[PDB]
Amino acid sequence: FNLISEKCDILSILRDHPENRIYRRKIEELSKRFTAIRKTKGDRNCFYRALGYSYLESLLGKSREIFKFKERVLQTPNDLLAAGFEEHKFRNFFNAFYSVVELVEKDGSVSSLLKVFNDQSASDHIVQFLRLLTSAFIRNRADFFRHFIDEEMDIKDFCTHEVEPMATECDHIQITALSQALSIALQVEYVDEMDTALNHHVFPEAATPSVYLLYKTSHYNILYA
Numbered sequence: 380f381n382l383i384s385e386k387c388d389i390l391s392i393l394r395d396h397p398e399n400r401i402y403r404r405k406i407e408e409l410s411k412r413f414t415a416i417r418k419t420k421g422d423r424n425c426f427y428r429a430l431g432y433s434y435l436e437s438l439l440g441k442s443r444e445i446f447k448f449k450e451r452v453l454q455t456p457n458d459l460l461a462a463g464f465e466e467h468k469f470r471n472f473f474n475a476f477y478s479v480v481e482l483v484e485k486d487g488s489v490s491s492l493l494k495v496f497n498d499q500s501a502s503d504h505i506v507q508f509l510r511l512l513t514s515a516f517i518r519n520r521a522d523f524f525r526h527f528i529d530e531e532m533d534i535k536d537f538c539t540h541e542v543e544p545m546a547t548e549c550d551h552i553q554i555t556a557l558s559q560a561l562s563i564a565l566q567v568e569y570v571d572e573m574d575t576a577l578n579h580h581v582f583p584e585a586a587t588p589s590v591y592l593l594y595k596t597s598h599y600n601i602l603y604a
């Protein structure tokens with residue numbers, strides 16, 4: 380369980396910040412709202428890897444929601460082609476993601492899903508697919524990322540350098556784009572060392588979340604309500 384850990388009690392993360400009054404306060408407050416956490420490996424890929432696992436885990440046993448998600452995933456090669464990606468270069472990554480979606484439908488266990496996301500090969504193929512889909516979704520909507528995010532920003536260079544490569548860290552643009560590309564509603568809780576309120580943001584702003592993530596010391600961990 381080196382990439383995505385077993386579930387632990389929320390207060391178990393006090394030991395990560397011993398004798399720290401702000402982190403202790405904020406972790407105690409978090410424990411009032413959430414019961415459990417899973418840790419992710421801090422390798423630069425942890426947003427993609429956490430969102431992918433947590434969203435697919437939330438679909439287990441839900442036959443209509445699985446059917447509708449699979450229908451969207453089958454169309455994602457068209458998003459990649461429209462942005463200039465070539466099929467023979469994304470085939471291996473697309474097939475690895477479609478395979479894990481079929482696993483959620485056919486096998487339906489947490490144990491089988493966690494084993495795929497802890498297999499370095501399968502899990503890194505899934506992450507690479509998610510990064511290429513993020514890139515494509517931004518490229519195909521460049522005026523929207525420039526109008527609402529980014530008036531002065533160079534979109535194509537941003538995607539080349541800060542989205543497509545393995546181990547590149549995320550900001551609001553990548554989170555917004557991947558949420559929109561797969562129709563995933565997520566809430567991110569922020570725990571920093573300033574003496575401020577514990578606070579969160581929802582992507583998209585409207586939504587009732589499927590997935591909760593904790594952003595602390597540059598890492599995205601998975602929370603359970």
Ligand SMILES: *CC(=O)NCc1cc(Br)cs1
Pocket residue numbers: 420421422423424425426596597598599
């Ligand atoms: C999400 C993720 O992989 N984070 C990588 C990190 C960078 C630092 Br500093 C700590 S974890």
